[PDB]
Amino acid sequence: MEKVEELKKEIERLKKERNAIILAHNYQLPEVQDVADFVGDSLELARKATKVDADVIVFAGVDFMAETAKILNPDKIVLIPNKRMANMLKVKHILEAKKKYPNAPVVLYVNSTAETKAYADVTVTSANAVDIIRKLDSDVIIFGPDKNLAHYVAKVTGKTIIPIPPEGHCYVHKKFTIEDVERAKKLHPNAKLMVHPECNPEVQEHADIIVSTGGMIRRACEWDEWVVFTEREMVYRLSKLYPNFYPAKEDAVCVGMKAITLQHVYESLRDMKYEVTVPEEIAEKARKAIERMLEMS
Amino acid sequence: MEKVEELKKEIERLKKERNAIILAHNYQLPEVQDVADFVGDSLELARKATKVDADVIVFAGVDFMAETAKILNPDKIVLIPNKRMANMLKVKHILEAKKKYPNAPVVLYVNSTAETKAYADVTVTSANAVDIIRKLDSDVIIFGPDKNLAHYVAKVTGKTIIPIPPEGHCYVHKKFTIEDVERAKKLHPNAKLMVHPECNPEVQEHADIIVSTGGMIRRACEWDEWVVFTEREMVYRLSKLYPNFYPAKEDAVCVGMKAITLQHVYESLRDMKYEVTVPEEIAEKARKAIERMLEMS
Numbered sequence: 001m002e003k004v005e006e007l008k009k010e011i012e013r014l015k016k017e018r019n020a021i022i023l024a025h026n027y028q029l030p031e032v033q034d035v036a037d038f039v040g041d042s043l044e045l046a047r048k049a050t051k052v053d054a055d056v057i058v059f060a061g062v063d064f065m066a067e068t069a070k071i072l073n074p075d076k077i078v079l080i081p082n083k084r085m086a087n088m089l090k091v092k093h094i095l096e097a098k099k100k101y102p103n104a105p106v107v108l109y110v111n112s113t114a115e116t117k118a119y120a121d122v123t124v125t126s127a128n129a130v131d132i133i134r135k136l137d138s139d140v141i142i143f144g145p146d147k148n149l150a151h152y153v154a155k156v157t158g159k160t161i162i163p164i165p166p167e168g169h170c171y172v173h174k175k176f177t178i179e180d181v182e183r184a185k186k187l188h189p190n191a192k193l194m195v196h197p198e199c200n201p202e203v204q205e206h207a208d209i210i211v212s213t214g215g216m217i218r219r220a221c222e223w224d225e226w227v228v229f230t231e232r233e234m235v236y237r238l239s240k241l242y243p244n245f246y247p248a249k250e251d252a253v254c255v256g257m258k259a260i261t262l263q264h265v266y267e268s269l270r271d272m273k274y275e276v277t278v279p280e281e282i283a284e285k286a287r288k289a290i291e292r293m294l295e296m297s
Numbered sequence: 298m299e300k301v302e303e304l305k306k307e308i309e310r311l312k313k314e315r316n317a318i319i320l321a322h323n324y325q326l327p328e329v330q331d332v333a334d335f336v337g338d339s340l341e342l343a344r345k346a347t348k349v350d351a352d353v354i355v356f357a358g359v360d361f362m363a364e365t366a367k368i369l370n371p372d373k374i375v376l377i378p379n380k381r382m383a384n385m386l387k388v389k390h391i392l393e394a395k396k397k398y399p400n401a402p403v404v405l406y407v408n409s410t411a412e413t414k415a416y417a418d419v420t421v422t423s424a425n426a427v428d429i430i431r432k433l434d435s436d437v438i439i440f441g442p443d444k445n446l447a448h449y450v451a452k453v454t455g456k457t458i459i460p461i462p463p464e465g466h467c468y469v470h471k472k473f474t475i476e477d478v479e480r481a482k483k484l485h486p487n488a489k490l491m492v493h494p495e496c497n498p499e500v501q502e503h504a505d506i507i508v509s510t511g512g513m514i515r516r517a518c519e520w521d522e523w524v525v526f527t528e529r530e531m532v533y534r535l536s537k538l539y540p541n542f543y544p545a546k547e548d549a550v551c552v553g554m555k556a557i558t559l560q561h562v563y564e565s566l567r568d569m570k571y572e573v574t575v576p577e578e579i580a581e582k583a584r585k586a587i588e589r590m591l592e593m594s
């Protein structure tokens with residue numbers, strides 16, 4: 001195609017004009033990798049991000065890795081070409097875990113909030129998690145937010161893995177967000193919203209009516225169809241009750257996300273599009289754990 | 298050490314006597330990798346397992362990968378050197394997901410029951426999940442049981458990822474097991490057991506008393522301290538209520554697991570120790586999805 005070749009020509013030009021370097025993950029599209037200056041795994045990209053002299057970094061990759069590069073580059077401009085379950089981990093979880101196991105290091109999988117990396121000793125990617133967790137002196141380790149990875153490491157190193165957030169708790173109401181609220185208005189515009197008390201306080205604010213499980217099965221008579229911010233069972237239950245209800249979230253996870261294409265990279269260099277920002281207070285704190293991971297890996 | 302060198306000498310001898318090959322994962326201990334005939338990643342090991350002529354395979358690796366090799370080798374003996382959240386996915390989940398999205402392929406992360414691989418089109422490892430999910434013709438994909446991986450793929454391919462088990466549901470009571478019951482007897486021997494109705498029916502059988510959330514906060518007067526098989530909040534709640542309660546599970550995940558050491562490999566060749574078995578009915582079905590993954594990767 002001539003479209004493709006013209007894009008690459010524009011991308012190469014904008015590189016010099018913006019003074020930009022382009023990093024892409026190994027799982028990105030070939031066309032994106034082609035224009036990328038560096039292509040690698042999560043760790044390689046993290047390490048490459050400490051050695052950038054360009055004023056601008058285009059991070060052709062997933063969000064938390066883009067964020068991780070910005071944390072390594074506070075005085076540069078980090079861009080993610082496209083628009084954007086890691087918000088499960090709260091700082092309180094780390095404090096309660098450090099209270100019971102005070103000599104256990106806090107290890108966070110790279111997919112985590114910067115706010116929580118600020119309370120971690122070291123970060124890991126999937127490929128270095130076992131390597132690093134073995135290396136830590138303690139045989140008791142605090143680890144999150146990825147349960148699967150936590151179980152996996154547990155199984156391979158045999159060490160005592162204390163997961164965060166702790167298991168034995170239901171996190172359904174926490175996985176609702178302000179963006180889930182707005183979607184329930186642009187869509188289902190003629191409808192009022194039910195919100196369980198245990199939801200995000202930000203979510204509680206835009207809540208039309210606020211009811212618990214019993215409050216829902218009673219006040220479900222002030223509209224024809226509702227938008228219920230709770231366990232999905234309660235959608236079928238109100239449905240059977242009053243045949244004259246839509247779940248707050250769709251089945252598909254992170255829908256709306258578009259893969260990063262050659263055009264995305266072009267439009268990002270040209271518009272300085274989608275800039276990754278982290279508060280310096282939290283960034284400079286969270287940065288310690290990331291650099292530690294580079295030291296051990 | 299001379300202990301080490303004598304072990305390797307015994308391992309090498311037992312190799313010929315049993316007619317065995319030893320496979321080890323890249324994240325295993327160096328000493329284990331040393332005696333291993335083949336060392337690789339999850340995919341490499343899966344592929345290597347279709348090309349074994351030995352009568353015995355020692356799988357120095359995590360359980361679901363050991364299981365995956367047995368599925369590729371029904372007529373051989375597969376051994377895992379040591380004693381043993383994938384049981385979250387049930388077949389019903391796949392049927393309900395295929396009902397709403399009938400033209401969506403069922404993709405399962407390798408860490409899943411064989412019983413569910415029997416209802417899958419293809420399996421993935423972390424390193425090939427994006428590669429393969431992109432390759433599938435459909436833009437709607439059913440994917441589990443690993444939410445993290447599902448979100449990650451969603452973000453990178455932009456496709457519509459329908460997770461299994463579906464989100465918006467609490468799975469606390471399902472993550473209890475018969476082994477969690479037995480642990481609450483060898484430990485806390487002088488105590489009776491509370492079990493929520495929504496637990497495993499196998500778990501329900503060994504349940505002393507069976508009560509719901511309200512039934513628990515009432516019948517908590519027939520012992521001094523209890524073992525509560527429910528959400529951990531209910532442990533602190535009974536605690537505050539009747540100061541005259543222990544969670545059913547410990548904080549640490551998969552504790553008891555021991556890393557595979559040089560001795561484990563020796564003791565496994567010598568005792569034919571810890572044999573991985575999968576029912577041929579289910580194995581020969583589950584095998585299709587694994588071989589498909591090798592074809593696409």
Ligand SMILES: [Cl-]
Binds near residue numbers: 025042060062065066
């Ligand atoms: Cl990335």
Ligand SMILES: [Cl-]
Binds near residue numbers: 258
């Ligand atoms: Cl976009």
Ligand SMILES: [Cl-]
Binds near residue numbers: 358360362363
């Ligand atoms: Cl393995």
Ligand SMILES: [Cl-]
Binds near residue numbers: 378379380555
């Ligand atoms: Cl063992």
